[PDB]
Structure formats: C-alpha cells, structure tokens
Scaffold this motif. Sequence first.
Motif, PDB file in Angstrom:
ATOM      1  N   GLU A  17       0.747  -1.195   0.031  1.00 32.20           N
ATOM      2  CA  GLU A  17       0.046   0.076  -0.081  1.00 32.20           C
ATOM      3  C   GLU A  17       1.046   1.095   0.174  1.00 32.20           C
ATOM      4  OE1 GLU A  17      -3.774  -1.430   0.180  1.00 32.20           O
ATOM      5  OE2 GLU A  17      -3.934  -0.264   1.921  1.00 32.20           O
ATOM      6  N   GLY A  19      -0.766   4.542  -0.012  1.00 33.28           N
ATOM      7  CA  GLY A  19      -1.725   5.740   0.399  1.00 33.28           C
ATOM      8  C   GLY A  19      -2.788   6.283  -0.143  1.00 33.28           C
ATOM      9  N   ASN A  33      -6.717   2.302   0.325  1.00 35.29           N
ATOM     10  CA  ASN A  33      -5.293   2.772  -0.017  1.00 35.29           C
ATOM     11  C   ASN A  33      -5.145   2.478  -1.528  1.00 35.29           C
ATOM     12  OD1 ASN A  33      -5.049   4.695   2.039  1.00 35.29           O
ATOM     13  ND2 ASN A  33      -3.164   3.313   2.952  1.00 35.29           N
ATOM     14  N   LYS A  73      -1.720  -6.166   4.096  1.00 33.58           N
ATOM     15  CA  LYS A  73      -2.299  -4.691   4.021  1.00 33.58           C
ATOM     16  C   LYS A  73      -3.288  -4.497   2.891  1.00 33.58           C
ATOM     17  CE  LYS A  73      -0.705  -1.928   7.398  1.00 33.58           C
ATOM     18  NZ  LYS A  73      -2.179  -1.782   8.017  1.00 33.58           N
ATOM     19  N   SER A  77      -7.660  -3.621   2.521  1.00 37.82           N
ATOM     20  CA  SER A  77      -8.004  -2.650   1.547  1.00 37.82           C
ATOM     21  C   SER A  77      -9.172  -3.385   0.409  1.00 37.82           C
ATOM     22  CB  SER A  77      -7.105  -1.812   0.815  1.00 37.82           C
ATOM     23  OG  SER A  77      -6.505  -0.932   1.517  1.00 37.82           O
TER      24      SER A  77
HETATM   25  C1  LIG Z   1      -3.809   4.155   4.169  1.00 35.96           C
HETATM   26  O1  LIG Z   1      -2.487   5.020   4.415  1.00 35.96           O
HETATM   27  C2  LIG Z   1      -2.352   5.338   5.956  1.00 35.96           C
HETATM   28  C3  LIG Z   1      -1.268   6.125   5.995  1.00 35.96           C
HETATM   29  O2  LIG Z   1      -0.047   5.233   5.669  1.00 35.96           O
HETATM   30  C4  LIG Z   1      -2.622   4.194   6.933  1.00 35.96           C
HETATM   31  O3  LIG Z   1      -3.048   4.768   8.401  1.00 35.96           O
HETATM   32  C5  LIG Z   1      -3.454   3.235   6.651  1.00 35.96           C
HETATM   33  O4  LIG Z   1      -3.618   2.084   7.269  1.00 35.96           O
HETATM   34  C6  LIG Z   1      -3.657   2.760   5.191  1.00 35.96           C
HETATM   35  N1  LIG Z   1      -4.747   2.005   4.799  1.00 35.96           N
HETATM   36  C7  LIG Z   1      -6.086   1.815   5.103  1.00 35.96           C
HETATM   37  C8  LIG Z   1      -6.612   0.566   5.593  1.00 35.96           C
HETATM   38  O5  LIG Z   1      -6.715   2.973   4.929  1.00 35.96           O
END
Ligand SMILES: *[C@@H]1O[C@H](CO)[C@@H](O)[C@H](O)[C@H]1NC(C)=O
Length: 244
Positions: A17, A19, A33, A73, A77
């Motif tokens: 991921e 962002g 993300n 991760k 998502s």
């Molecule tokens: C998206 O990005 C932020 C910053 O890196 C992070 O806190 C988050 O875990 C990421 N993924 C999701 C599930 O929103």
Amino acid sequence: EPYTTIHQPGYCAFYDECGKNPELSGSLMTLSNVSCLSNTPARKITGDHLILLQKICPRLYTGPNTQACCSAKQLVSLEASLSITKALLTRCPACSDNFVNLHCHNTCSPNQSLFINVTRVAQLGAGQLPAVVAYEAFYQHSFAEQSYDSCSRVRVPAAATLAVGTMCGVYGSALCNAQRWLNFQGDTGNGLAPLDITFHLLEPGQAVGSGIQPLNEGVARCNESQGDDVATCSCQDCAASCPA
Ligand SMILES: *[C@@H]1O[C@H](CO)[C@@H](O)[C@H](O)[C@H]1NC(C)=O
Ligand SMILES: *[C@@H]1O[C@H](CO)[C@@H](O)[C@H](O)[C@H]1NC(C)=O
C-alpha cells in the motif's frame, strides 16, 4: 516511461500500500488505499497473511505453497472496497464468489502482470515507490461473459430488484452488459473504484502479438454446487437453475 515492462508468470505489477488516491476528491470516506508500483516476482504467503488470503481470496489459496501479489495490508483494502457490492450478492454465493475472485486476481494473482498493465502512477511520498493510480485489466471475453451471466439475474436481498441494475450506471438491467458492468466497477466518477481500472474484454484473435495474456479463470455456475456444500442458487436468481 513504461510502468509494467515485465509481463511474466510469477510476476507482480504492484505490491503493498502507498496511501490515498490523489485523483479521488474528498467527498466520501475512502475505504481503500492505493498500491505501490512493483514489477517484481511474487511473494511466498505465510503466517497471518495466509489466513487473510484464504478467507478473502479463497480461490487463490493453493495449499501451503502459495504465492501472491498482494500484501496483508492490500487484502484489508480489498475486502473494504468489496463490502458494498458483496452485500448486494448475498442471495447467490456462487455469483458473489465469482465477483470477488475477479478482483482478487486483479490484486493478488501471482501472475497478475500477465493480464494487468499499469497506465498511470503518482508519487505520494519522498523516497517512496510510485503509487499505481490507473491500470488496465485484460480479460478473455468468455471469462467476463460467464462472470456477468452468473450475476445478471440475482436479486437484491429481500427484494425483486436486480443487483446488476444497481451497478450499471445510466444503463438499467435491460441495457446492462458484461462490458459495461465492469466499466462501472473500475470507474471513479461512479464512486465505486479506488482507482481507474480499464477492462479490455478480448477474444483470442485480439490478444495475439500483444505481449499480454488475458485472464481466463474458471467461473462457478450458479446451477452447480461448490465444494461439498451441495447447494445451488434459486431459479429466480439463476436462469441456469431453471426449470425450478
Ligand atoms: C492508508 O494509509 C495510511 C497512512 O499510511 C494508513 O494509516 C492506513 O493504514 C492505510 N490503509 C488503510 C487501511 O486505510
Ligand atoms: C501498457 O501501458 C503502456 C503505457 O500506456 C502502453 O504503451 C502499452 O501498450 C500497454 N500495454 C498493452 C496495451 O498491452
């Protein structure tokens, strides 16, 4: 500059991921993300990562020796952005399975680079790898038609409304299409997709010489039972399950 130059089996287009999607306007809370450009060999999936993959993308679990192109991760998502559509297809689990597997392959397939070619990226941070913001998925036409057909007749939970009609933009259920159904799903203006997906539905004679090998995965027929369950979607949700 090319972004997906290696189109090989065992090779990913993106991994991990990166962002937020910058092209997505802050209007509705983004549940996903975006992925990091990573034209690299597929990963060996172990530990916690395995269970997630097994539960989120069941058809991509290939025993203890599993490889995939999505991190732990990325799987969170994935299920986040699928939650909305999965809800509409809870009448017919085979169609639901098909829809999920379609996006699972797009994100997790250890071969993803063969049918995925990223078209646009964005630099989200300094020193960080570029973020995948637009890509094109190459599917075999029959794989897409069969996926759509399994869902084309499913009703919305406790209603007679067809779920594909709630998913085909300006076209109703009557005008809906395998092509258009997918076009909506990879559309930002339709507020569904986290990023631009362009679906190309090809027949063998088109993919010749492209240096790309379109997805042609097995799709479950709703008139057939999966695994040992011995259960099939009703004739009202599944044309193939008729006569009732
Ligand atoms: C998206 O990005 C932020 C910053 O890196 C992070 O806190 C988050 O875990 C990421 N993924 C999701 C599930 O929103
Ligand atoms: C992948 O993307 C690049 C950049 O747009 C493009 O030139 C290339 O032809 C694409 N691959 C295809 C269509 O197979």
